[PDB]
Structure formats: C-alpha cells, structure tokens
C-alpha cells in the first residue's frame, strides 16, 4: 500500500478530574476496536456522561469535543463497583462508533461520529504542536489529577472504615481522623498538589489504629 | 549549550502485575526529581519490594534491572491504604537516588545507582528498537494487566462487601456471588483477558442486591 488511513490524533473520553483517557492511540491504522472497563465516581451514581474527545492534551477541555451522551439506569452501588465498558470502534469507512455498556444491566448507549468530524488538518497540526509545547504543563496536570484522585480514594475509603469501625475506634483517634478527613476534603477542592499530599500525610500519620481495626475486620 | 545530558531510557519501578511504572520519562534533562505515592497490594502487607528498572518495555522483566531493595515496618492496613512515596532524584552528577518512604511511620529506605549503571549505548539502541518492534504486544499486555488488576479489585472489594453484608444478603444471592468470586479468582491466575472479563461480567450480573446493600450501609 502506498497509503494508510491512520488516526492523526488520539481518541478517548473525559474521566474524573477532567482528564482525557485515550482509548485509541494516535497513528493507529483503521479499522480498529478498543475497549476499556470504567466504573462510577460517586456512591449510588445512576448515570455516566460519555464525553468523546479528540486530541493529545491531558486536560479534557484542551481537546476537541466530538460529542457526548449519557448512559443511565445504573443500579445503586458503591463508587468504583459498576462495570461500564466503553468501546471505540472505527470501521473501514472511518466512522467512529462509541458505546457504553453496563455489564450488570446489559443496558447500552452509543454515539456515532462521522469520518469528517473533529479537527481539520490545520487544527490537527496546531494540536500536535500545542501538546509538545505544553508537555511539561500537561505532565504536571497529570500528577495533580492523579494526586487528587488518590486523595479522594483515601478520603472515601477512610470514611467507610470509620463507620465500619464504630466503637472499636478510640475517641482520640476519631477526633484526629475526622479533623484530617475534613482538611483533606478541603484540599481536594483546590489545585495545590502539595496541599493535598500534606493532608494525605496527616491522615496516614493519625490513622494507624484505624488501619489496624479495618485490617482485622476482614482478616 | 551544545549538549544536554538526558535520560536515554525511561526509569521506574516494578508494580503489581509485573509492569514497569515510569517515574522518569525518557529524554528528561537532568537534574530532575519525580515522586509518586504508591500503596500495598495485599491486606496486612508488612513490606514492599522496590525493583528499580531502566527501559521502555511494559513488562518489568523486559527492562533492565538497576537493583532493588525493600522497605519494611509497614503497619497493619487494608491493601491500598498505606502511602509509600517513591522518589527518583537524578542529580547533576547523573547519579540516581531512589527512595521509598512510608508516610504513616516516616520510615525510609534508599538505593543509590551510579551514573554508569544500566544499559550501554548498544543495549539502549537494542531497547528503543525492541520497544517499537513490540509496541503492539506491549499494548496488549498493558490491557491484560489493567484487566487483571481491576478484577482483583472487584474480587476483593466484593468479598469485603459480602462479609459486611452478613444476613442482609439473601442465601441465593450469596450462592451466586461466591461461585462467581471463585471463578473470577481462578481466571485471575491465568493470562486470558477474555476469561477475566467474562467472570467480572458474571459477578456484575449476580451482585445487584449486594451492591444495593453496600450502597445503603454507607449512605
């Protein structure tokens, strides 16, 4: 072949923290199909918004929006338990089919994106260009979002563990733990990575007795 | 400057599933310092092995081993709760300092890696070469390890949720759930991604009542 049709830009979805998660890597030859199983951000979340993105930037907002759609009817569950499988299928005509399917309920919703949608050749080059021009800033944003996402996980896991602990947890421990949880929740509202890591650190320092009770409860 | 000293290969650690997690990206100009907060794979894990890797391959075994060391004295905790912060610092002399620090106990262990350690120029080119030659296989292995790691998370979270549920969980539900958990544990022993995803799917289909009880317990 003298020619290949290839993706000029990565393709994916917006995930928690406002980042782009790539399902199809830049310069993939089509037809191609990739899928990944995602889950929910919130306890008892009934729906997920599937925001389809084209671009090379870490921040979702910095990429091209190809469109979006929701999948609802998600049954009550703890965050991170539902299995929402997201498939990007680009066919021989260059049409992108995106689906989101709930493996519990079997419910599925799709968006179809025409071969001609997305960024034109100029904008593509502008995008490849900006992604190299901002590689460092994007890397910093990835580290921030990853830190906030971890701290959110610690926030929530710890709160569940406090509840499960009940009276097993000494009063002084609970005082120290909740004040650290409150401060971590606040730090998670900003974009100061150092701040988040300092509250996470505080929580690790004050939670030892709680870790031991939680480890024991499921031992 | 007519010259820059740059990393010819990515640098990182082996993490669960036998993958390389990069802390310092290929072609980073030094001095540079990056850190990431990791946690434990197992409930009540007392120590983490820090296996320092140089290379571009997804599989840890496919990279160059720069050495390794353990950090122990991790206090009893559920998997994923301890905060083990891992820092790669390359100084002006090109010496790599790797540390692992437990944010609960403050305990820290280090390895120092000489500028001359790692792959020689030949082997570097062999490595850049193999990583492009195996890009597709490495991508497949990443998808497998990511799937097994998710399924392990579902396995373990679900088992905890069963215990916390107690008699709230109907007998027929518990029968279906445990048989699916057993089958998922078995699938997680292999390297058949389809198999793992099929057991995960089974668990999502049979766990609805359990998700609802768990969502309610912390509502």
């Amino acid at each position: 072949v003298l020619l290949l049709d290839v993706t000029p830009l990565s393709l994916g979805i917006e995930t928690m923290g406002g980042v782009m998660t790539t399902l199809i890597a830049k310069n993939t030859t089509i037809p191609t199909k990739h899928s990944q199983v995602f889950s929910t951000a919130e306890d008892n979340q009934s729906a997920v918004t599937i925001h389809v993105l084209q671009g090379e930037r870490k921040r979702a907002a910095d990429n091209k929006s190809l469109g979006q759609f929701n999948l609802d009817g998600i049954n009550p569950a703890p965050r991170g338990m539902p299995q929402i499988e997201v498939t990007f299928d680009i066919d021989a005509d260059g049409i992108l089919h995106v689906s989101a399917k709930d493996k519990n309920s079997g419910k599925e919703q799709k968006i179809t994106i025409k071969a001609s949608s997305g960024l034109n050749e100029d904008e593509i080059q502008k995008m490849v260009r900006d992604a190299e021009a901002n590689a460092e800033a994007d890397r910093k944003f990835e580290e921030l979002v990853q830190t906030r996402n971890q701290g959110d996980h610690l926030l929530h896991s710890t709160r569940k563990q406090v509840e499960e602990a009940g009276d097993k947890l000494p009063a002084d421990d609970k005082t120290a733990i909740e004040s650290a949880l409150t401060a971590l929740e606040t730090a998670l509202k900003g974009e100061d990575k150092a701040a988040i890591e300092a509250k996470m650190q505080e929580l690790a320092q004050v939670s030892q007795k709680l870790m031991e009770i939680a480890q024991q409860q499921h031992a | 400057v007519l010259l820059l000293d740059v990393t010819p290969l990515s640098l990182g650690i082996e993490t669960m599933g036998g993958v390389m997690t990069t802390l310092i990206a290929k072609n980073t100009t030094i001095p540079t310092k990056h850190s990431q907060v990791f946690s434990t794979a197992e409930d009540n894990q007392s120590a983490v092995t820090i296996h320092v890797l140089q290379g571009e391959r997804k599989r840890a075994a496919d990279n160059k081993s720069l050495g390794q060391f353990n950090l122990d004295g991790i206090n009893p905790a559920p998997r994923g709760m301890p905060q083990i912060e891992v820092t790669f610092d390359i100084d002006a002399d090109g010496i790599l300092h790797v540390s692992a620090k437990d944010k609960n106990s403050g305990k820290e262990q280090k390895i120092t890696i000489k500028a001359s350690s790692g792959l020689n120029e030949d082997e570097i080119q062999k490595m850049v070469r193999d990583a492009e030659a195996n890009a597709e296989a490495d991508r497949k292995f990443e998808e497998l390890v990511q799937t097994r790691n998710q399924g392990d998370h579902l396995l373990h979270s679900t088992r905890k949720q069963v215990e916390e549920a107690g008699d709230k969980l109907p007998a027929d539900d518990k029968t279906a759930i445990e048989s699916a958990l057993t089958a998922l544990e078995t699938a997680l022993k292999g390297e058949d991604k389809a198999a793992i995803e099929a057991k995960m799917q089974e668990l999502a289909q049979v766990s609805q009542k359990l998700m609802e009880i768990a969502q309610q317990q912390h509502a």
């Binding site: 995930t15 889950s39 951000a41 299995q83 | -």
Partner: peptide
C-alpha cells in the same frame, strides 16, 4: 478502574 462522573 478509572471513574466517569455523572451527567
């Protein structure tokens, strides 16, 4: 798994 926010 990576998480997706609600609508």
């Amino acid at each position: 798994p990576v998480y997706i926010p609600p609508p």
